[PDB]
Design a protein around this ligand. Sequence first.
Ligand code: CL
Length: 211
Amino acid sequence: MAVTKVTVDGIEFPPTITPPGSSKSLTLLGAGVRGIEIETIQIKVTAIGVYAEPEVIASHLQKWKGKSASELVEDDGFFKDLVQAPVEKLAKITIIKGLKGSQYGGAVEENIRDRLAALDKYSEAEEEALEEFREFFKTKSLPKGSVIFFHWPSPSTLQISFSTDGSLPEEAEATVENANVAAALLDVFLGENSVSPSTKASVAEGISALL
Ligand SMILES: [Cl-]
């Protein structure tokens, strides 16, 4: 029997997902990969899938209707609107090349702090939030195939989950309630100096299609 699958270089991403502890079901908008470059050698380390409520986020982005995928990815304002949009969002991250949690966490945290410090939005509250974020990854190992779940039930709140085998948890492990960190983390992936332009392209064409 036939099945429809979404894949990024063979890594399978479900077309819809229900975040840990959530009732809602989110729809995949697009997916790409985060690739680290050494010399002229490119290493893919993670696959990233971006999910949200399709009708709702389509409604909030209606000013971009009929705008082409080519035109959206060219425009930082669209991605600002996508990041700001007050809808549930989820990032599913599948580890390609294994690594230790404190490494991934450390790098992402530094990226966030850089963004927030640049914006003059880094105080003790953010440091504590990032303490939580840091502590979450400190204790864990991220082997190939393990998956991280970043859940934004609203733009101000971040919920983190993780499964070593790639299955879907039914409740979140960590909650970071800090608007700046939550938004910055989303900005790591969909923002101006994205760790994954491919993911942004994929989301752009998905959203363009969705409108
Ligand atoms: Cl990543």
